[PDB]
Amino acid sequence: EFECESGPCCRNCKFLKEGTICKRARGDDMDDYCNGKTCDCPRNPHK
C-alpha cells in the first residue's frame, strides 16, 4: 500500500514540510529542521 515510517518529522505516513523545526539548538547554534524527505530529526551538520 504505502511506504510508511514514523518519527518526529512524519505524521500519518506523510513528511512534515521541509524547514519545520524539530529540535531547538543550545546557545547560538542552528536549530535542527525536518528536510521533508525522512522521518528522523537530522542533527544539523553545521555546528
Numbering used by the authors: -1 to 45
Which sentences did the original study use to describe this structure?
Echistatin (Ech) is a short disintegrin isolated from Echis carinatus that contains 49 residues with 4 disulfide bonds. Similar to the reported structures of other disintegrins, Ech has a well-defined core composed of a series of nonclassical turns crosslinked by disulfide bonds (C2-C11, C7-C32, C8-C37, and C20-C39). The RGD motif is located in a protruding loop that is formed by two antiparallel β-strands (residues 16–20 and 29–31).
The diffraction data of Ech were obtained to a resolution of 1.80 Å from a single frozen crystal, which contained two molecules per asymmetric unit. Superimposition of the backbones of chains A and B with an RMSD value of 0.226 Å demonstrated that their overall structures were very similar, except for the RGD loop and C-terminal loop. Therefore, the R and D side chains of the chain B structure interacted with each other and formed hydrogen bonds. In contrast to chain B, the R and D side chains in the RGD loop of chain A are far from each other. These results showed that the K45 residue stabilizes the conformation of Ech’s C-terminus and is important for its integrin recognition.
